[PDB]
CSV table of C-alpha atoms in Angstrom, one decimal:
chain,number,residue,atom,x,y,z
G,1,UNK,CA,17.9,3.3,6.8
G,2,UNK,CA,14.6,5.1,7.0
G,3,UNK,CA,13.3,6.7,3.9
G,4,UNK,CA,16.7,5.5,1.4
G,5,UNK,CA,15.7,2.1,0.1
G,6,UNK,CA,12.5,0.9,0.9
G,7,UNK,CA,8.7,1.6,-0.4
G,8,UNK,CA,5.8,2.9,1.4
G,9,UNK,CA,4.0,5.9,-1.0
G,10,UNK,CA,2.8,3.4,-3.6
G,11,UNK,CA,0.4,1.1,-1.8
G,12,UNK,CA,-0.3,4.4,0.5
G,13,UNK,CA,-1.1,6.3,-3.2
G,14,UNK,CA,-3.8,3.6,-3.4
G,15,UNK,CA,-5.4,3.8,-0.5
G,16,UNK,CA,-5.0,7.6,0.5
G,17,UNK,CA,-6.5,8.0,-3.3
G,18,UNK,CA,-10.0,6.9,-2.3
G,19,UNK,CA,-9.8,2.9,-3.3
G,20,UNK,CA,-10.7,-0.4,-2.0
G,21,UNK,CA,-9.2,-4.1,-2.0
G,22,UNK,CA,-9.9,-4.9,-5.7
G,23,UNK,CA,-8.8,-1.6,-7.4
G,24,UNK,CA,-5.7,-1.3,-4.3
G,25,UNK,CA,-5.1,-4.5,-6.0
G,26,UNK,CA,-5.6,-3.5,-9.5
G,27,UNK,CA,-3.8,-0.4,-9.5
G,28,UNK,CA,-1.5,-1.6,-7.1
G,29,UNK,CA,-0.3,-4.9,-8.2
G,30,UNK,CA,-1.0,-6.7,-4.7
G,31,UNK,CA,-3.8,-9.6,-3.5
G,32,UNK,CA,-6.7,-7.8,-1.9
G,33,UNK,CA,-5.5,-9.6,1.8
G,34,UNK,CA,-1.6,-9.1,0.7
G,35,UNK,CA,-2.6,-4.9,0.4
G,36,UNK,CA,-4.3,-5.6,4.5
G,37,UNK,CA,-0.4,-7.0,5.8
G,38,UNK,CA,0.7,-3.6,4.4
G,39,UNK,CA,-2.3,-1.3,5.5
G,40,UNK,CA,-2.2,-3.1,9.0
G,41,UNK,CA,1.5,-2.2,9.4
G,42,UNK,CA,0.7,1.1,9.0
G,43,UNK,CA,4.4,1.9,7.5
């Protein structure tokens, strides 16, 4: 599917929010590389 089952707007929240690496990771519960394998995809 596209936008049924399947995330995108959270670790975009963190980012599009004003953030970086250690509060994207905070915030968003993610390791500060693991938030750069989503950010890099660009999804």
């Amino acid at each position: 599917g596209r936008k049924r089952k399947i995330d995108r707007d959270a670790v975009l929240n963190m980012w599009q929010q004003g953030l970086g690496a250690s509060h994207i990771s905070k915030t968003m519960n993610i390791a500060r590389s693991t938030v750069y394998k989503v950010i890099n995809e660009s999804n």
